[PDB]
Design an enzyme around this catalytic site. Structure first.
Site, PDB file in Angstrom:
ATOM      1  CB  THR B 179      26.227  49.875  34.536  1.00 45.87           C
ATOM      2  OG1 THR B 179      25.968  50.868  35.771  1.00 45.87           O
ATOM      3  CG2 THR B 179      24.447  49.574  34.163  1.00 45.87           C
ATOM      4  CD  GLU B 254      39.775  36.235  68.431  1.00 47.63           C
ATOM      5  OE1 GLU B 254      39.965  37.330  69.362  1.00 47.63           O
ATOM      6  OE2 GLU B 254      39.372  35.594  68.934  1.00 47.63           O
TER       7      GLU B 254
END
Ligand SMILES: Nc1nc2c(ncn2[C@@H]2O[C@H](COP(=O)(O)OP(=O)(O)OP(=O)(O)O)[C@@H](O)[C@H]2O)c(=O)[nH]1
Ligand SMILES: Nc1ncnc2c1ncn2[C@@H]1O[C@H](COP(=O)(O)OP(=O)(O)CP(=O)(O)O)[C@@H](O)[C@H]1O
Ligand SMILES: Nc1nc2c(ncn2[C@@H]2O[C@H](COP(=O)(O)OP(=O)(O)O)[C@@H](O)[C@H]2O)c(=O)[nH]1
Ligand SMILES: Nc1nc(NCc2ccc3c(c2)OCO3)cc(-c2cccc3[nH]ccc23)n1
Ligand SMILES: Nc1nc(NCc2ccc3c(c2)OCO3)cc(-c2cccc3[nH]ccc23)n1
Ligand SMILES: Nc1nc(NCc2ccc3c(c2)OCO3)cc(-c2cccc3[nH]ccc23)n1
Ligand SMILES: [Ca+2]
Ligand SMILES: [Ca+2]
Ligand SMILES: [Mg+2]
Ligand SMILES: [Mg+2]
Ligand SMILES: [Mg+2]
Lengths: 422, 439, 320, 62
Positions: B179, B254
């Site tokens: 909104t 990683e």
């Protein structure tokens, strides 16, 4: 705790204020003594926005009542919900303002304004977290117009980062008390331009045309107009008064609705204006209809900067989305292309009294310039001959101040036109 | 064992956090009071789940998490909900007044008054870590707090923990569930300010989650609860390798190594399958080949875009449930012969594949059906830049008129910051074009 | 009403499509940057496909397939033909072609040193003239079909519409764009067949047919009278096969079946016919114009099969 | 195709499949920026309150 402080000034302001409080008190299950006798915790879940909690487990409106004459506040105290207001929140003088903005703003009003601000401060001090202020008043008289804008200016000075919101009844020759209304209105709009965040333009012309044409009332009274005003105001405060999906405060609403600081004057609308249940297509079509607008302006003569639609009642959110999208997609040229997704929709499950389904409309449209043009023309028609000016210069105003107010309002019109052609 | 600290900022971040931690509790067998009967080491341990849960002497398993909102109303529901006992109160931080969808109010005006308290509570958690890996930051792009406070916070975490990895989970704005008109300003402003502080960011477009809920869960009008449960399934797929034994994505570092060779182009596209309705009374269960194929349909992506018209820089597949490598390899061979998967020339064409045997968990009485196998694909494709284009287009439309700019300037932000952030977005779109397309 | 936006001012085809859509009552044209459209008639260059299909409650359709450029450029077409196993280097219905830049097939083409007439484009027998001309080098078809009256070269344009469902519709009317100069093996006026190039440099521009355009009824009559066969049997089977093979090759890359916005596109296939009534593909054009005489009919077909199919209101094509 | 780096535990396995080979700010700066924004805020507030003090003086003159 997101508290709002309410202020109503003058005859018009206090009558429409009173209707607002009776209507929302009914929605929250609060009786005239201030006792809760509702059926649902949702009614109380956000009650503290507008009501203080007292010792007798009483809920008392966070409401300040101001006039320069006593008449209307005696009528409030005798009105149906009159006992619910805090007695210390009635702040009235004796002189009156004689429909004279200069009396409201500079002479009679200045004597009372400090005592009004003291009560505002006492209410704010006990607020957990004041979000801001709403004022009800007319612009055509002297107290609501002149003293109201004085109050607004002082509140801005002492609470400069709080939201100031007004419901402002704009004069029309079709429903007129004195000839000087355009002067009082022009002087007031300049103040609102500088010191409010949101102003709902409620035009007595439009309220009259609705009562007469649509509701088929041959002789509409102020009571009939104020019924529409109170229902509209209930609609526009629904999204913060009842539990639901939205985590909003007046500032987040303002930030979503107001793209430029001076262009903060909204057209309100209401649907439906009878027992036949109204389908979502019917609510949607009527809420966008000129005939449902309360600031007698044709929205087809301008463009929407922003729109909020608030639906109340049990209905399909799917169906609401589909119909709102239909109106936007089929009427795309009336919505500015450079503010994407500028139509916002709220749904509250709790309907108002009597209606099963209703919609309240808030439009920030450039067509509102028509209202200001109207007032400006009436202003000029008198001011070019200085007619009735002695009422004002006798209270110390100079002609120069009128020239500046007229210029400010022609500039406001020019700004609305700049964004309408963009 | 190496710890991960989760930070949930603003309404979206807090509620998504709630859904994620609920799901982690169900996956690890942790009850709402914090007890974990399967944990035979009372009051400590270096199990994989201790990357996310610490332990008290009373056997309570406590999320390594901070919740941070500038108004109190969302975190109070956590304070009084089913998992109120899970979290220590000092983990739950609220102000009194929110940022009103205004980046400047979150970053500058309000953020300045809570940032030191937040960093202090974060420090309190860090002092309990023996090998802190870094942070998982959950927030919306669109809210004033999720955008502006989150970027402030990211700057300060870079100062105070400069060696540590930081991952984001970011909710990209959708008009169907949001909104506010100014979400494009805030998104552009936060991405600019957070870019060089985030090692890897998973964007979730509320429009994509919305459509998935409607299409596959038969939900007429999805709520935040629906959206957050689905999002939490995807987040859980992503963090499972940090929370369970395993050999792929076992550390925050990683994620960057496997998914991000260009540090600025660090927005992987997530694609998840299968999403199946609990109410669907006859469900034929989907094979490895079908769900891995699903991974290449835009309708299952967390951002709607078309990977056929960009290039891959990395791609890996996180399976949960009944999955053996043989079926994965057969599926990949088939998909390669049937679909448009083009890698950039300087990266090998290949998939890193992780399989976790425990099947996906669902929330009882939820909207999602339990399945015997599911997959999350994380692919770094240039096609995700389409979302930046959409956002940038909306920014350009409003900023050309300076619409709403005064709300930001009035909080003390300068207009130059708008065009600096926008320029940086233009450079980001250019990076993605140079990597992804040929004349 | 359905709503649409026009973003390519120079399209004749879509200017006529636009005017047709308006004359229904149920379509409104919007300013080129209003996003609340059902239908985009897009620009040819850098159409913003990434901004389509993100308007709640609007089904959005665009008159271009993203990725179809791969088919509609000489280098990309050569690469797609050579590199797609369903087409292969031994496509037989496409002339031997090599990509050459000024992955450069310079030496690979040179190995085809030894009928050695080639054309370079984006005409000679010595390679040096061409490779010193800087593109694709393509085997020039030395033995074209020459119409008896005037002994003159031509090319065939076919219009093909691909709808959102990836149906492939061949417009029943094609056109032959002829030369009106005798073909010579010895000056690009007897060798080429562009509409502009004949209506300018070539002297005789209208002698045999109007505007150097012959339509199927005439060409079919000629093939019956001169060679004793039909256009359908002798030529059109091959045209249909080629069009279908090309578009089926790229379907996985460009289909909008499972995507959030829908696409259609009108293509212009250009063919050469050799003296053995063998059809060769010359060109795929992604933004063709149409011959004047057939605008009205073809544009109406686009509305019927491509637009109203998605947005219905209150056959001239063969489905391949 | 080539399957490399197969790792296995009781909770799962991982591996890699190759289809084709290839071919700063300080705390001081942050504090300064935040304080500059706060100064701009203070400045706008002072401009507002100065304008309002001008209005009060005009009211007294009237
Ligand atoms: N997926 C998802 N999105 C949400 C949720 N809550 C809010 N949003 C999105 O977040 C955006 C609004 O941001 P919020 O998180 O509510 O704002 P905030 O961070 O709390 O900052 P404030 O303005 O101070 O309230 C909109 O785009 C919403 O669509 C949620 O629970 N789930
Ligand atoms: N390999 C070949 N053998 C014989 N003639 C050829 C040829 N390649 C091209 N031509 C001739 O050259 C003409 C124009 O070539 P080409 O098709 O490359 O132009 P173009 O790019 O403008 C497509 P169009 O003109 O149809 O829009 C063809 O009409 C054909 O007569
Ligand atoms: N809609 C509405 N307008 C009113 C009401 N009372 C007065 N007005 C209008 O307000 C203007 C007169 O202002 P008023 O409120 O009486 O002056 P004040 O009390 O001195 O501020 C005129 O334009 C009236 O038409 C009311 O109850 N409802
Ligand atoms: N600006 C604005 N809009 C309103 N409508 C609804 C809405 C819902 C969701 C939205 C939205 C607007 O904008 C972003 O998302 C009400 C109000 C208001 C005014 C004055 C006093 C008030 N007391 C309570 C409310 C209120 N003010
Ligand atoms: N930027 C800005 N905002 C405005 N209203 C919202 C707001 C309120 C409190 C805030 C805030 C912003 O920022 C932090 O505190 C008004 C103005 C303005 C300036 C100069 C002349 C003006 N005439 C009318 C208006 C205006 N300018
Ligand atoms: N209503 C309103 N708001 C304003 N906002 C700005 C703002 C910035 C930072 C804030 C703040 C407010 O509050 C505390 O921090 C400006 C004005 C204005 C109007 C007309 C003439 C004026 N000359 C100077 C100012 C002014 N009027
Ligand atoms: Ca007096
Ligand atoms: Ca343990
Ligand atoms: Mg009166
Ligand atoms: Mg919030
Ligand atoms: Mg061509």
């Amino acid at each position: 705790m997101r508290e709002i402080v309410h202020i109503q000034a003058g005859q018009c302001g206090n009558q429409i204020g009173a209707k607002f409080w009776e209507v929302i008190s009914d929605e929250h299950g609060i009786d005239p003594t201030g006792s809760y006798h509702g059926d649902s915790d949702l009614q109380l879940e956000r009650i503290n926005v507008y009501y203080n909690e007292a010792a007798g487990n009483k809920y008392v409106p966070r409401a300040i009542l101001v006039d320069l004459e006593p008449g209307t506040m005696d009528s409030v105290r005798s009105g149906p919900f009159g006992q619910i207001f805090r007695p210390d929140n009635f702040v009235f003088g004796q002189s009156g303002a004689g429909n004279n903005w200069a009396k409201g703003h500079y002479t009679e009003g200045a004597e009372l304004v400090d005592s009004v601000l003291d009560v505002v401060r006492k209410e704010s001090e006990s607020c957990d977290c004041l979000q801001g202020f709403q004022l009800t008043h007319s612009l055509g008289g002297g107290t609501g117009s002149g003293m109201g804008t004085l109050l607004i200016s002082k509140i801005r000075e002492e609470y400069p980062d709080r939201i100031m919101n007004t419901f402002s009844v704009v004069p029309s020759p079709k429903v007129s008390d004195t000839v000087v209304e355009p002067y009082n209105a022009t002087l007031s709009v300049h103040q609102l331009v500088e010191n409010t965040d949101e102003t709902y333009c409620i035009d007595n012309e439009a309220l009259y045309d609705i009562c007469f044409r649509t509701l088929k009332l041959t002789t509409p009274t102020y009571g009939d107009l104020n019924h529409l005003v109170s229902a509209t105001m209930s609609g526009v405060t629904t999204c913060l008064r009842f539990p639901g999906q939205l985590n909003a405060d007046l500032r987040k609403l303002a930030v979503n609705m107001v793209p430029f600081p001076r262009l903060h004057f909204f057209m309100p609308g209401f649907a439906p204006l009878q027992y036949r249940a109204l389908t979502v297509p019917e609510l949607t079509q009527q809420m966008f209809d000129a005939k449902n607008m309360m600031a007698a302006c044709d929205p087809r003569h301008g463009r929407y900067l922003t729109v909020a639609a608030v639906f109340r009642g049990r209905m399909s959110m799917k169906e609401v989305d589909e119909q709102m999208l239909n109106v936007q997609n089929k009427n795309s040229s009336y919505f500015v292309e450079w503010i994407p997704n500028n139509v916002k929709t709220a749904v509250c499950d709790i309907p108002p009294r009597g209606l099963k389904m209703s919609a309240t409309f808030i439009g920030n449209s450039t067509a509102i310039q028509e209202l200001f043009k109207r007032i400006s023309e009436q202003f000029t028609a008198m001011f070019r001959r200085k007619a009735f000016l002695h009422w004002y210069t006798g209270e110390g105003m100079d002609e120069m101040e009128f020239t500046e107010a007229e210029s400010n309002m022609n500039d406001l019109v020019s700004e609305y036109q700049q964004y309408q052609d963009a | 064992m190496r710890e991960c600290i989760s930070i949930h900022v603003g309404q979206a971040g807090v509620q998504i956090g709630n859904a994620c931690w609920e799901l982690y509790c169900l996956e690890h067998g942790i009850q709402p009071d914090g007890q974990m009967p399967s944990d035979k080491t009372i009051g400590g341990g270096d199990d994989s789940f201790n990357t996310f849960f610490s332990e008290t002497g009373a056997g309570k398993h406590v999320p390594r998490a901070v919740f941070v909102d500038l108004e109190p109303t969302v975190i109070d529901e956590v304070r009084t909900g089913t998992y109120r006992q899970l979290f220590h109160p000092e983990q739950l931080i609220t102000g009194k007044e929110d940022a009103a969808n205004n980046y400047a109010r979150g970053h500058y005006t309000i953020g300045k008054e809570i940032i030191d308290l937040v960093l202090d509570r974060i420090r309190k958690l860090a002092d309990q870590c023996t090998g802190l890996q870094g942070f998982l930051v959950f927030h919306s792009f669109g809210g004033g707090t999720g955008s502006g406070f989150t970027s402030l916070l990211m700057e300060r975490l870079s100062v105070d923990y400069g060696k540590k990895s930081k991952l984001e989970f970011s909710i990209y704005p959708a008009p169907q569930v949001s909104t506010a008109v100014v979400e494009p300003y805030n998104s552009i402003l936060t991405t600019h300010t957070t870019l060089e502080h985030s090692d890897c960011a998973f964007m979730v477009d509320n429009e994509a989650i919305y459509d998935i809920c409607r299409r596959n869960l038969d939900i007429e009008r999805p709520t935040y609860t629906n959206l957050n449960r689905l999002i939490s399934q995807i987040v859980s797929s992503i963090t499972a390798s940090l929370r369970f034994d395993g050999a792929l994505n076992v550390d925050l570092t990683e994620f960057q190594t496997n998914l991000v060779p260009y540090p600025r182009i660090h927005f992987p596209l997530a694609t998840y399958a299968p999403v199946i309705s609990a109410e669907k009374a006859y469900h034929e269960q989907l094979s490895v080949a079908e769900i891995t194929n699903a991974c290449f349909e835009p309708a299952n992506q967390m951002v709607k875009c078309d990977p056929r018209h960009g290039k891959y820089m990395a791609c890996c597949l996180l399976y949960r449930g009944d999955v053996v490598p043989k079926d994965v390899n057969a599926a990949i061979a088939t998909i390669k012969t049937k679909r448009s998967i083009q890698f950039v020339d300087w990266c090998p064409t290949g998939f890193k594949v992780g399989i976790n045997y425990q099947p996906p968990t669902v929330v009882p009485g939820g909207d999602l059906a339990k399945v015997q196998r599911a997959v999350c694909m994380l692919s770094n494709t240039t096609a995700i830049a389409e979302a930046w284009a959409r956002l940038d287009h909306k920014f350009d439309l409003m900023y050309a008129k300076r619409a709403f700019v005064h709300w930001y300037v009035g909080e003390g932000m300068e207009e130059g910051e708008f065009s600096e952030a926008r320029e940086d977005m233009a450079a980001l779109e250019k990076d993605y074009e140079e990597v992804g397309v040929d004349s | 009403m359905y709503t649409f936006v026009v973003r390519d001012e120079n399209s004749s085809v879509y200017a006529e499509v636009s005017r047709l859509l308006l004359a229904t009552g149920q379509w409104k044209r919007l300013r080129k940057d209003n996003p609340r459209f059902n239908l985009m008639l897009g620009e040819r260059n850098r159409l913003p496909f990434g901004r389509l299909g993100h308007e709640p409650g609007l089904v959005q359709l665009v008159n271009y397939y993203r990725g179809a450029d791969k088919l509609c450029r000489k280098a990309s077409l050569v690469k797609l033909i050579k590199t797609s196993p369903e087409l292969s280097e031994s496509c037989t219905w496409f002339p031997e072609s090599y990509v050459i830049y000024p992955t450069d097939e310079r030496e690979v083409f040179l190995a085809a040193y030894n009928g050695n007439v080639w054309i370079a484009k984006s005409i000679s027998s010595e390679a040096s003239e061409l490779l010193d001309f800087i593109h694709v080098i393509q085997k020039y078809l030395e033995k074209p079909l020459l119409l008896e009256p005037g002994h003159r070269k031509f090319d065939i344009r076919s219009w093909v519409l691909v709808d959102h469902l990836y149906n492939i519709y061949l417009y029943r009317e094609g056109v032959l764009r002829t030369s009106s100069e005798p073909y010579n093996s010895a000056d690009k006026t007897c060798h080429l067949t562009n509409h502009c190039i004949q209506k300018e440099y070539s002297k005789n521009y209208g002698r045999y047919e109007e505007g150097n355009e012959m339509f199927f009824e005439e060409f079919n009559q000629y093939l019956m009278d001169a060679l004793n066969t039909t256009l359908e049997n002798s030529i059109l089977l091959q045209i249909k096969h080629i069009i279908r093979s090309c578009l089926m090759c790229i379907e996985p890359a460009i289909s909008t079946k499972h995507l959030h916005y829908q696409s259609f596109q009108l293509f212009g296939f250009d063919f050469m016919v050799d003296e053995e009534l063998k059809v060769w593909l010359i060109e795929v054009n992604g933004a063709p114009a149409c011959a004047q005489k057939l605008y009205a009919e073809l544009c109406q077909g686009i509305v019927d099969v491509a637009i109203s199919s998605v947005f219905p209101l209150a056959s001239i094509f063969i489905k391949l | 195709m080539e399957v490399i780096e197969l790792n296995k535990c009781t909770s799962g396995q991982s591996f890699e499949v190759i289809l084709k080979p290839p071919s700063d700010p300080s705390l001081e700066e942050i504090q300064k920026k935040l304080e500059a924004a706060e100064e701009r805020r203070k400045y706008q507030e002072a401009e507002l309150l100065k304008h309002l003090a001008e209005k009060r003086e005009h009211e007294r003159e009237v």
